[PDB]
Write an enzyme that holds these catalytic residues in place. Sequence first.
Site, PDB file in Angstrom:
ATOM      1  N   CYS A  36       0.820  -1.209   0.000  1.00  0.00           N
ATOM      2  CA  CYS A  36       0.000   0.000   0.000  1.00  0.00           C
ATOM      3  C   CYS A  36       0.856   1.261   0.000  1.00  0.00           C
ATOM      4  CB  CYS A  36      -0.949  -0.004   1.200  1.00  0.00           C
ATOM      5  SG  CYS A  36      -2.373   1.111   1.042  1.00  0.00           S
ATOM      6  N   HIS A  40      -3.596  -5.213   0.400  1.00  0.00           N
ATOM      7  CA  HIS A  40      -3.136  -5.578   1.740  1.00  0.00           C
ATOM      8  C   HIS A  40      -3.068  -7.096   1.860  1.00  0.00           C
ATOM      9  CE1 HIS A  40      -3.048  -1.774   4.148  1.00  0.00           C
ATOM     10  NE2 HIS A  40      -3.708  -1.350   3.085  1.00  0.00           N
ATOM     11  N   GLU A  71      -1.213  -8.743   3.925  1.00  0.00           N
ATOM     12  CA  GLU A  71      -0.919  -9.159   5.291  1.00  0.00           C
ATOM     13  C   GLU A  71      -2.168  -9.588   6.048  1.00  0.00           C
ATOM     14  OE1 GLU A  71      -1.444  -6.150   4.463  1.00  0.00           O
ATOM     15  OE2 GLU A  71      -2.407  -5.062   6.105  1.00  0.00           O
TER      16      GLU A  71
END
Lengths: 252, 249
Positions: free
Chosen positions: B109, B217, B219
């Site tokens: 990001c 994202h 993660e």
Amino acid sequence: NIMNNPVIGVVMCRNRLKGHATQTLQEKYLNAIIHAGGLPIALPHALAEPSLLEQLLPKLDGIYLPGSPSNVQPHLYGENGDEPDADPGRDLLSMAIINAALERRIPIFAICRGLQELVVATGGSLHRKLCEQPELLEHREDPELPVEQQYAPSHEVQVEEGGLLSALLPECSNFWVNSLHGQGAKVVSPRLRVEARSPDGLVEAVSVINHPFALGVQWHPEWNSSEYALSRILFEGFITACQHHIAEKQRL
Amino acid sequence: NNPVIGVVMCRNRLKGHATQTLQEKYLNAIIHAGGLPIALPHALAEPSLLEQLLPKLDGIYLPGSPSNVQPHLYGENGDEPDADPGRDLLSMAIINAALERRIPIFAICRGLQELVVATGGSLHRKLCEQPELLEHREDPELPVEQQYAPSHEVQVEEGGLLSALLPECSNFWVNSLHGQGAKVVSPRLRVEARSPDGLVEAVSVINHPFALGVQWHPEWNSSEYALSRILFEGFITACQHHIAEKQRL
Ligand SMILES: [Mn+2]
Ligand SMILES: [Mn+2]
């Protein structure tokens, strides 16, 4: 500074911001290490895993235990019940990295909660409510005052001769410190030596016997450390010990 | 052995004190993929400190953040109420240092936008003000689980890093939680993926073993997503190659 800067591992704290568990480290703890010549790296709680911790320790020249609003879980020193504001993850990492650094003779500098972590890790105990002991001063800050007043000088401490503080401060046996703690050392293990006391007898500083430099203080020397001559000497002595640890790491 | 991953932190104000922060979901993803993460404070942007610390790092990890890069870092002017100049300074410095040292980089990001700016690119500051684009921002009032839910598609540009990690599929759906995006991409970078509206959603540094940035994202519960698991594993594998590289010298 014209200097090779020792690697300082800094134990982080847990918080929850905007919906997410977060590992945090206040900048004032970082600024003090920088000004004294250290290279800080922040250590998340997941590093308490033994296989990861063993890989990281050879790369650390010193261990840095900052203060925090959280209190150590009372069961870590054999007591029952809980206290407000716990950080079990930091407890896990702090206990593991202290025990490891004490065996490896890695220098440790602990502040406020770090001192309490040092006392508990070596077999001691804590007062969970200093305000409930009538014989003691008010060691807590006023939380409704602005931040600068909270870290202002609060009470004096008297150095116990024969330890690290006496070697670092040959002239000063007595000086002013701030105070922002509702918990404090109760029983101190024989593994630890008392370094300083407030006028009410409360232990405000300890050090590990037979360790080159494992020092804890109950006050907050990180607060504008460059402006306080005594805070500057404490961080200077920690970094000097890490330099000595680097030099000693080639006499093994 | 687990490669040491340097993770760039963000600056926040907590209880009236400036604080360096790092969300655990970024750390958990590195741990599950086999990395040893350490958090890098902004003060490490000092060149002497950075140069001493880079040989000890096996990879660099640039997480996402609510903050945006200051526009003057890519030659533009404008207000940025949610800024982090300390993170800006450290990110550009460590990206440049890592690109010269062939240290793997994985950026998410804001990290992707840092990659674009550090290599000479620019950014759209208000994707919402362009009628041709999809809504790439999340709804901050929805629960976090659907904030990070799949939101739009991306198409891989074949011949680059993403085609090496996912040779079989060129199209997948990703979450989207960004109000800014890449505008001009420098020729030092290659476009790795685009959303259907044409916005660049992934880049990688040509001339580098593994310097990859994604706009989404990965993660978020990384171990439970196939694409997310592959991206983090490829980053760690890249770092292991870098370790063998340093031991051969
Ligand atoms: Mn006190
Ligand atoms: Mn998007």
